[PDB]
Amino acid sequence: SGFRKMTFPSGKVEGCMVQVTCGTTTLNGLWLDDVVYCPRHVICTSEDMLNPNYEDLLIRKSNHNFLVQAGNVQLRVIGHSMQNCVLKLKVDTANPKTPKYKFVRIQPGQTFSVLACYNGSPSGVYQCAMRPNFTIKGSFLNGSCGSVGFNIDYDCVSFCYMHHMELPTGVHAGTDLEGNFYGPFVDRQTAQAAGTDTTITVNVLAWLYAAVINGDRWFLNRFTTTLNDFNLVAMKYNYEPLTQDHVDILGPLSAQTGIAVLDMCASLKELLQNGMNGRTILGSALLEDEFTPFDVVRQCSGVTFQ
Amino acid sequence: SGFRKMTFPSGKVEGCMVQVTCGTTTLNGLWLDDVVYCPRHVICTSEDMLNPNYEDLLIRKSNHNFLVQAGNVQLRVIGHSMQNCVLKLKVDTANPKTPKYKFVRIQPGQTFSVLACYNGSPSGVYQCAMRPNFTIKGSFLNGSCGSVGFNIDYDCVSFCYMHHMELPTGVHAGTDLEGNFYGPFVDRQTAQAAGTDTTITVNVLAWLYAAVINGDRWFLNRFTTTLNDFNLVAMKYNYEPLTQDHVDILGPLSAQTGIAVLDMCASLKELLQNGMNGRTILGSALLEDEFTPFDVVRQCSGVTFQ
């Protein structure tokens, strides 16, 4: 038993983390096959980031202006191109540790593991979720740009995130591995703010099902509610509107534990209107929304992926 | 910026995770050089665990009764021995992925990363702390035995934990890599209970310093307190007695932020006597005690270890 925030084994990703140097700037890159992917603002200095013409700045750069280091080994750059907000440095040697991988644009609410890196060296890994406002609440200091988010299914590494910037509000924004920013953020140093960050309701119900499996049952009420009435309460407390697809996704969690989805929605409705009354659930005094229904089934059933 | 629960990159440990089979039982083992370390209750069935004579059960076993699998490769066992609560299976081939490692018996309050495994396959990694009652609050299902805890400094893998059992209370107990159980627990299926689990006070103050660095300052009071008076309040709310060594360890956190340790102890005293009043600190409504003062300096300064 037990339930904690888990990340995928980051071994397959460490073998792809490189250091990219371009002028006075250095950040991390992702080395898959003979292409190194890195944020495109490595070609900017601190003064260019106010309003950089990336196409113009990229013209002044040649292949030999990109210093890619894989540990102690240096990869000779033989081609550079940019799509959206990412660079593609074609290198001469392919990564011998390239795992089976995909580039996946995840949807909001879904989670992934983040391998934080500095100077191409992995520094730690933590679990994060794609907030409804397309931000993530990771932890990134200077030099962490280029760190990737990913999910590990079977043996395939599903890359989904690349960190790009810290917003003035303290949260983080980035792109998929094709360079497309999640949300309406751009890779500039301007007044950027994220919208209303609501709560992923389907994740909260999955986290509540994991509580029942683990022994916490004080919240299981003696009431019920319909999907329409529950969504009325959800909008008052800034929760994502629950759809029937969410109810269908919570099917196995409902079948494993015996509490119907709408029955758990009433328990969540009671928690939104009465609070926790000083109690805790899975060691937390708040309602957690960064566990997808798959994340719970992973941990409450023991799925491996080596 | 940002602050989250972080684990060390588990890559160096995945290359050491093997599967050990002995009869109908299968759990995980740690393969360093030409020795595989695994829990000693792999030689027991479900009925032996009430009161197993491990020396007697180990006599009935020979080298060829131990089936060690490293992925698809099988390691031929050429020698078996047990020290305390761990087995040592001498194998013919040394692990080509053995990192620089140590066997370290950590002290309570210190943290480590746990790589959960099933059938020798890594399944996920989460950060945990050695509670004052020598338990850990991980997450372990059947087949997770043999999973290790570790810390990564520089390039050296400091192994410190090996999971052994789920207590009836739902928490977990284990040994160091020399087989010595943390705490008064034994590797049997008997009525075992952990003592009073108190709060690691020095960790809470470090987590409060990380809050100040990250922008949370609502708890920084206009009072102060002495070490004696604070320890009086700490014992009322079941907190570890703060020593001068703890104050000395919080030195750099005090110097980086400007709030003295005793000044922060008054803010913590106010939080113990008044609660959070509905507010949160670093996204938590409770007081976190699973961040060592080193864990904060790791994350608030960007220390890498590849």
Residue numbers in the entry:
A (entry chain A), B (entry chain A): 1 to 306
Paper text:
SARS-CoV-2 Mpro is a cysteine protease that forms a dimer composed of two protomers. Each protomer comprises the chymotrypsin and 3C-like peptidase domains I and II (residues 10–99 and 100–182, respectively), with the active site consisting of a Cys145-His41 catalytic dyad located in the cleft between the two antiparallel-β-barrel domains. Mpro cleaves the polyproteins at 11 positions with a consensus cleavage sequence Leu Gln | (Ser, Ala, Gly) to release nsp’s, which are required to assemble the viral replication-transcription complex. In addition to the indispensable role in viral replication, SARS-CoV-2 Mpro also plays an essential role in escaping antiviral defense by cleaving host cell proteins.
Crystal structures of 11 Mpro mutants provided structural insight into their altered functionality. We employed crystallographic structural analysis together with a high fidelity FRET activity assay by our group to assess the functional and structural changes in Mpro mutants. The crystal structures of several variants revealed the changes in side chains orientations of residues in the active site comprising substrate binding pockets, especially S2 and S4, which might lead to altered amino acids preferences. Accordingly, changes in KM values for most of variants were observed, indicating alterations in a mode of substrate binding. We observe the highest level of conformational plasticity around the S2′ and S3′ binding pockets with N142 and S46 being the most flexible residues within the structures we solved. Also, we observed that the charge distribution in the active site changes quite dramatically even upon a single substitution especially around the S3′ and S2 binding pockets. This might explain why with most mutants we see the changes in binding affinities and not the kcat values.
